[PDB]
């Protein structure tokens, strides 16, 4: 019955304005005892209050954001609004909205949230992965299966999309969480298979990056001893 | 700001265990009125936090009667009598008497299951890197339990511990390890100026250490 829906844009430049929209239903801003708050939580990590909005347009905002920070209201459109200024790298986070108990002393009991928007402040421009293939140590050894990976560095934004064999090789796979090398991003990926597998077979990384409309295919290939 | 702080950090559960989660505020949480504002909120992966204790002992409307919570001032408890699969994910405890809001840094409720030892794969940089001027040497340490692990870069005997990333998976769905990866990065002139290649793991499940390393020149 009650449904919170947030909004925005997903990428900004440092000192940028963020301004982003919690689109609601369920319940109506204008009746005593409703607030909207937003949240933010930074990948990982834990959540931070942002600000909280009354159904008396009263407002409340975290001290330590205050200057930056202005909660707003469209009671007729169901909007509650957040601007943000000056924005800088910190500010990357998913921000949620979410209503709280519906009671009458509201600052606690956040039952319904939002599905949350990813915000990422960054300056980076746009670039495409480099994407090596992880072939096993020039070598020789005579085990059942082998493991093989795929190395994707110097990208941005995030996400990157990494499958094996165009997705029909699926198992033993383990692709990792990108990491943040530098304003640009890195992930890697392994595979388990079989020996008889491989090089018998072809096993391909394949890495496409949307937001660059780039697609690398890399087959992975036996070392030389150069 | 009122210091919400949460221990464990990380509890390791079988399905069907009791689970006690402890939150202790850096100041007392009683109002002008009596009634104090202590919370629980739940979040799974790829969902959004759900509200499940308030008031420090009232259960939510829709939450199971294995979710109990009790304490008071400083020193609070969230206890959950038999640990079913849909309860695992991090629990936050909450404040709302005193503006800012917070929220303690959460507890990760995760799957016990029998050690494992990681299965490590070291890969010398790939000819194709070299060529525009990089050098990275990357290991992989799948498939291990519990989560704790340390990872050690040598080069030719000598650690390393500048540009080396690492990242690591979320507990497995099927098969409850963990696995990482860590790359160590270099300059293709630094990578060159040396030989031996060693990727160290340290895990409870052995007293020695699982090592994985190359020579550069001769294989």
């Known amino acids: 019955q009650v449904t919170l829906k947030e909004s925005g844009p997903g990428i900004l430049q440092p000192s940028q304005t963020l301004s982003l929209t919690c689109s609601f239903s369920g319940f109506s801003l204008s009746t005593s005892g409703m607030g909207v708050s937003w949240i933010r939580q930074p990948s990982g990590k834990g959540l931070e209050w942002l600000a909280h909005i009354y159904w008396d347009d009263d407002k409340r905002y975290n001290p330590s954001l205050k200057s930056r920070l202005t909660i707003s209201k469209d009671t007729s459109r169901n909007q509650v609004f957040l601007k943000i200024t000056s924005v800088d790298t910190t500010d990357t986070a998913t921000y949620y909205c979410?209503?709280?108990?519906?009671?009458?002393?509201?600052?606690?009991?956040?039952?319904?949230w939002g599905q949350g928007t990813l915000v990422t402040v960054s300056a980076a421009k746009t670039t495409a992965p480099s994407v090596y293939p992880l072939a096993p140590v020039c070598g020789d050894t005579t085990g059942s299966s082998v493991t093989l990976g795929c190395l994707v560095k110097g990208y941005f934004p995030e996400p990157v999309t990494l499958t094996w064999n165009s997705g029909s090789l699926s198992s033993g796979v383990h692709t990792f969480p990108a990491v943040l090398q530098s304003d640009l991003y890195t992930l890697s990926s392994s595979v388990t298979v079989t020996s008889s597998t491989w090089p018998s077979q072809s096993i391909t990384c394949n890495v496409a990056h949307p937001a660059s409309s780039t697609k690398v295919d890399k087959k992975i290939e036996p070392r030389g001893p150069t | 700001d009122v210091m919400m702080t949460q221990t464990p950090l990380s509890l390791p559960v079988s399905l069907g265990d009791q689970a006690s989660i402890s939150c202790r505020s850096s100041?007392?949480?009683?109002?002008?009125?009596?009634?104090?504002?202590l919370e629980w909120y739940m979040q799974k992966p790829g969902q959004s936090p759900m509200l499940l204790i308030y008031?420090?002992?009232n259960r939510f409307s829709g939450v199971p009667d294995r979710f109990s919570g009790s304490g008071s001032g400083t020193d609070f408890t969230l206890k959950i009598s038999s640990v079913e699969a849909e309860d695992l994910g991090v629990f936050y405890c909450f404040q709302g008497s005193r503006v800012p809001l917070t929220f303690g840094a959460g507890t990760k409720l995760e799957l016990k299951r029998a050690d494992a030892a990681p299965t490590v794969s070291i890969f010398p940089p790939s000819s194709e890197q070299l060529t525009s001027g990089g050098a990275s040497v990357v290991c992989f340490l799948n498939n291990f339990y519990p989560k704790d692990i340390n990872v050690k870069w040598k080069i030719d005997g000598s650690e390393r511990q500048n540009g080396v990333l690492n990242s690591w998976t979320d507990q497995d769905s099927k098969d409850s390890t963990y696995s990482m990866s860590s790359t160590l990065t270099l300059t293709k002139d630094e990578y060159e100026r040396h030989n031996s290649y060693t990727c160290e793991a340290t895990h409870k499940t052995s007293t020695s250490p699982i090592v994985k390393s190359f020579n550069r020149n001769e294989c």
């Open positions: 008031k420090v002992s």
């Open positions: 100041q007392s949480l009683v109002h002008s009125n009596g009634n104090t504002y």
């Open positions: 979410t209503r709280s108990s519906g009671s009458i002393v509201i600052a606690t009991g956040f039952a319904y």
